[PDB]
């Protein structure tokens, strides 16, 4: 209920956040379900906008 | 002074807001992509259209 509270502008920052934590794998595997359980409640809930905004860095982020 | 309408998607629960004021993710009607987290005053549900005098401000908490 406190993760749907944020605007979409922070979600575009939030994907750049997890784009950086993929680089530090020690942060990743030590917090692997919580990173997993947060993207997949956001990108469900903020699906229609992230799929409809076009930005070739976002394709390079999500890959 | 053009006015941009917006349709309500999801009322926000558990956010700590001042009584009387409720917090709502709206969707722009004229372009169904965007969203903006605005506050209402009166009683609001989903699937009703809301009137915005200004688009670009995005309302935060009112303590």
């Amino acid at each position: 209920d406190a993760l749907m509270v944020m605007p979409f502008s922070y979600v575009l920052k939030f994907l750049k956040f997890i784009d950086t934590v993929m680089q530090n794998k020690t942060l990743l595997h030590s917090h692997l379900p919580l990173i997993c359980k947060n993207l997949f409640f956001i990108i469900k809930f903020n699906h229609k906008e992230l799929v409809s905004q076009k930005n070739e860095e976002l394709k390079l982020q999500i890959n | 002074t053009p006015v941009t309408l917006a349709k309500v998607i999801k009322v926000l629960g558990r956010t700590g807001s001042r009584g009387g004021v409720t917090q709502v993710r709206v969707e722009f009607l004229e372009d169904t992509s965007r969203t903006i987290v605005r506050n209402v005053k009166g009683p609001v549900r989903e699937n009703d259209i809301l009137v915005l005098m200004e688009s670009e401000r995005e309302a935060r908490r009112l303590r």
């Binding site: 209920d1 993760l3 509270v5 922070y10 | 935060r60 908490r61």
Partner: peptide, 11 residues
Amino acid sequence: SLKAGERLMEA
């Protein structure tokens, strides 16, 4: 004291 979820956002 901030309400949670907001304090995610400015952090």
